Every structure is written in C-alpha cells, then in structure tokens.
Amino acid sequence: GTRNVIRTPANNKLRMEDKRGEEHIKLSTEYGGKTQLNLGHNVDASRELRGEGAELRTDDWISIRGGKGIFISADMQPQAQGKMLDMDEAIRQLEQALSLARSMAKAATAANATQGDISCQQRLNASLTDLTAPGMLLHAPDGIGMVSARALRIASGSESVGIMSGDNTDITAGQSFTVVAEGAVSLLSRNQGMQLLAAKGRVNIQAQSDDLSMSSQQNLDIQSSEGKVTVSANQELILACGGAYIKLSGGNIELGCPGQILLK
Template identity: 50%
Template sequence: MTARVTSAKANDIYAWQDASGLYRVKFDADREDKGQGQESMPVRLAKPYGGDVYGFHFPLIQGTEVAIAFHEGDPDRPYIAHALHDSRHVDPVTEKNSTRNVIRTPANNKLRMEDKRGEEHIKLSTDYGGKTQLNLGHNVDAIRKLRGEGFELRTDSWGGIRAGKGIFITADSQPEAQGKVLDMAAVHSLLTQAVSQMESLSQAASAAKAQLLQYEQQQALMEEKLLALKQAVLLMSAPEGIALASGSHLQAVASENIYMTAGQNVELGAKKNITLAASEKISIFTETEGIEAIVAKGDLISQAQSGNIEVIAKQNISLTSTTEGMTFTAAKTLTFTCAGGAYIRLSGGNIELGCPGDIMMKQSKLLYSGPASMQSNIPELPDSGPQSMSFMLLDALGNAAPSTMKVTLFDSKSKEQIWSSAFNDGESGCFEPPESENFHAIIGDDKWTSLFSYNDEHDIEDETDDDLDFDEHGPQYDGELNEQDKE
C-alpha cells in the first residue's frame, strides 16, 4: 500500500519522529479526516543496514510517498518498506543524467558519483556559507562543462588543514598510487644535497676563518623531524619549483632558525628597502668570486659603533674619489706604516715621520710658513647603553598585584639568585641583566604560588615547598634579551 509521511507541523521541512524514530503516515486510501500527525500508528522505517548505533539514516520529511508493508501480513504491524518518487517529487536522476549516482539531502548536502566513461568524477558538497566542495576526477560545472581535472578542495568560507602528527605536501609523481603514502625519496635526495652543500661551504668558511654554517642542525632537522614525519612538521616538495605570492604581505617566522639553501643563486629584490638586523652578528662569506657593494645614488655608510673596522687584502687596497677629495680623520692618532719600517704618525698637533732608510723629497718648491691647524669633524655615534627590564603583574580584571607579591630572578645555570624586587602598584623595579643572559623569573608571594614563563606558555601551579627545585618545575623564564629594553 502507498502512503505519505505526515507531521504535526504544517509545511514541516524536517522529519517528524517520536523518541524511538518512528513515523506517522497517511494512507492514500484513507479518506477519514484525522488530526494532523495522528493519521496512523507509529511505523518503523526499513533500512538496508542498521544496528545499535550504526546504519543508514536518511530521515523522511512530510509529503514523501512511501510503500507500506505489513510484518508477516499482520495489518496491525505496518512498516515503511521504502520511499518512492512520484509526479510531484520527480527522481533527480533521469534519462538526462542517468550515468550519475547521487545521495542528496533536502538541504542540498550532496555526494555525486559520475560513471560516464572518460568523465568519471566524485563531488562532495554543502551549500552552507556559500559553496564548500571536494571535487575529484573530471570536474565539471552545473552545465557539465569541464572545470579541471584532478582534485579540488574549495570553499566560499574559511578553510583549515590540520594534522597533529605532521603534513607532507608534494608534487612528486606516484603513478597509479603505487608506493607508500609518505614516500619521500625525492625530497630526501634534495634535503641531503642541501646539507652536503652547506657542509662544503662551512669547510671553506672555516679555512678562511669566517663564521661557520650550522649544517649539523640542518642534518638533525632532516633526520630527526622531517623524514617520515617523525615529529609534527609541515614538509613541502615539488620537482619543478614552488612559488609563494601575496597581494599584500608575506611573513616567515621561526622561533629558532631559518635555513635557506640554493644549488645555484639566491636573489633578493625590493622596490624600496631591504633591511637586515641581528642582535649578535651578521657574517658574509664568498669562496671564489668576491663581494660587491655598489650604490648608484646616495651614500655608502659603514660604522662600528662600539668596536673596530678592519680591512685586509692580500694584494692591493685602492680608495679613489673621482670628482671630490678624501678625508682621513682620527680622534687621537692617525698612523701610516709600511712593512719596511717607514711610518707617518699624526697625533695631537704634531706630525712624526720615521724610517730606517732615506727620505726622498721631489718638488719644484718647498714652502714654509707659520703654524696652522684644521678642525677635525668627529661624528658622535649612538650609545647603546645597558639593557633594562621590569615586570608588571595584574589580575584578570586589570587590578595591580598586592605589595606582598615579588619577582625573583635566578641564573639559569647556577640557579643562584641574581635579583629580586617587590611590586609597587603592580610594577617591579628595573633590572639591568648582563647582555644576552638567560635566567629564570619566579613571581609570587612568600610561598611561590604562581609560576610564569616568559615564552607565553604560562604554567600556574600551587607549590608550597620553600626549596625552589628548577629540575622539578622546569624553567619559568627562559628568554634571551635583545638590544631593545623589555618592560
């Protein structure tokens, strides 16, 4: 017998079921005017697969035509055998698209599998937030025009890809899905080659007494983290190139190191400025072809604001001004020497000439006059004074910490106390630590109830032991100061 699914709600867009998932139906042969949603006893829906917490679950909504069967022919035990399409609810798969296999919900959540030979594809989609789709194979639009091939994961809303154990993205070919999922032979070869290149350059730099490259750390990164995704990393590889493009900004951040290796050239270009800054050292080394620094317009400035400038060449050093002059200035002494022992020294208001041999002077005239002097223009360099820092302690509402709270700093190696200060209106006194010094900071009251970490991993623990055991609790402040004051 045929019937239609009913609901106690008019124009219900969702399935109307009881607590057991049973439906109400109105038989097509039933001419009695019963209350809406009370046209039949509760009936079950037969499914091709079902069990306790599993099975096929596609709820039927109001107006769906169904076929009613009776268990063992008992008219008091009806159930919904299956759902039917009719003239009012035409089958979405007809002679026009008979090669398609579709699962689609009333809200247009859809799984479509196309079986037309040469155009096979799978589409998984939802209309929430616009369109979110996973397209596989021969991808087409609404009028079956080709959009592309392969796979596409797209959305009009936000997107995220997350894998807690690591992600491997590669354009290296693996035909017919032969091989392991994490087959990294190609990227392994590239990474090994990069480490080998850096090792070779590091050896050349060592011979020249230049800054060594940390190729051992690159080797450790490759072997201990990247290969086989031993740790939670993102590894990307492509045999013919990778491009990153942004219409605005592009940022690369690493809490430790950034390694860049090229088999040939590394080229940096900017329409305006390129700025390099390091809190410790910048080292430049070339093995064979030299270094060029050319300024088409403007000045070339080199300063050592608290140290020396040393220029050494195995052959000649040439300084030339093509249109103006040259000035050598020293605050105390200016000395010119030669390997043979001859020298000229300018110091104070005196000039001293000395040599173990002869002084030869060739001129048309030698003119003498009274004393004269020239004012030296000594530039004033910036003074990078001592670093300083202070602590502020507020509660969640922004109120200042009580005066019973204090901060104490301990040396990260010896664990000896190096400074302590109470909080006054939520702020501690200023501390001037040694440059680039690592230390632990503990903030709390006399029982040290609160432990804070400088690297934003805030650990809050209850600890009443007066003996501060860093090995048990781990570092609570482990940061390296830079050239800027931290407060």
C-alpha cells in the first residue's frame, strides 16, 4: 500500500512512498552503514518521521564534486521554479560585501592606511556570480555557522582572504590572537577610535628596525599611573613646544626658548 519498492537481495533499494502528504523516495545501499539518499518525508524503520527534505548520508565519506562550481544555498526556490543557479540573494550579498570593501579601501587611502586587496575580491565577485568560474558559493539567508571542536582553516593560497561585516567583526580567542603579515599590519578605525588594551601583561610596541611615530591631532597623554615613565634616546632627546625646546644630546642639556626660563 502506497509503497513501491525496487529491492535487491542485498537490500539495495529504491523505495517510493506514495502516501499523500508524506511522500518520500529512498535510495539506499547497505554499504558504509546505510549510505542513502532520502528525499521528502523521510521516515525511520518504524515509519516515524525522522526528517523533511533531502538527506545524503553515509558512515563513510561524502564527496560533492562540481567541475564548474558548487552552489550551496539555503535560499527557498519553491517548486523548483527558476534556474538551478538562481542566486539573486547570494549575489546581493557578494555585491554588498564588495562595495563595502571598496568604500573602506577608499577610506584607507584617505587615512594613509595600507589599502586592502580589492582586485582579487572583485575577481571573486566575477567568478562566483552565476559561478562563471569553478568557485564555491555558500549562502544562507539566516546565517552560516562553520564549527568544529578541532582546528578550522580558511586559506587562500595565492590571493586574499576578505572578511566583510555590515556589523562588527568579532574575534574571540580562548588563547591568543596572533597576526603575522609579510608586508604591513594596518588597523584603521573610521569613527570610534582605537583601543589597544592589555588587561594584564606587558604592552610592547616596537619598530624593531625603523622609525616609530605616535601622533594625535588633539591632546596626547602618556602616563604611568603607579610606576615610572622613562624616555631614552640614543642620539638626541628633544622636547619642543612653541619655539621652546629641551634637548639632551652629546652629554649636554640645552634649554632653549624665545621667552623666559622660569624655575619655581
């Protein structure tokens, strides 16, 4: 009743369940656990619903190989009406991310920050839009979670990794956040400033083989709240303001000013 089964003696089966409102197709082999494709109203052995939709499952490996590209999408396309690669919302996301990156790259240029790699991201947009190149596009309207107890790797071998967020980009490290860049490290805040804080542990800022420049347009405050402040130069220590200066150089101290030197 309402079950059409092509079953082999080895229990390779193609089962079609006809019960209206609970139709399903099961393509199942006994190898690798039950390696199965379950479509529709998927039930267990006791015919209780164990899931709705499409399940590709195995105890062994799963390989999904698309020579022209992979589109994995949580975007509803009811009744399969539309192209297989209909990705309008994913394309909107790609364009939004790219335009955000481009506007931020202009902002970085204006602030003399190191610009991002717009070229490879624009090329990625071209590649992934309609998957004209064999890329991979993962899109979900309600968020994507990539999780593992073990390590995760996101790696571009030859090009850039771009992370775009309309909101925050939050990194939470249970141990440490480390960046090694072969070229530059550039952090640009556009509106709300920058906080570089160690709740505990030493803060060490080094131009190990070059100049260090620390400037503000407005007031610059350097403070040790409970300890010492030591400023040491090897060649020359200069404090200058408004024509007045104090210079420590050679083995001399020079206090020069156009006005008066007052000792109180």
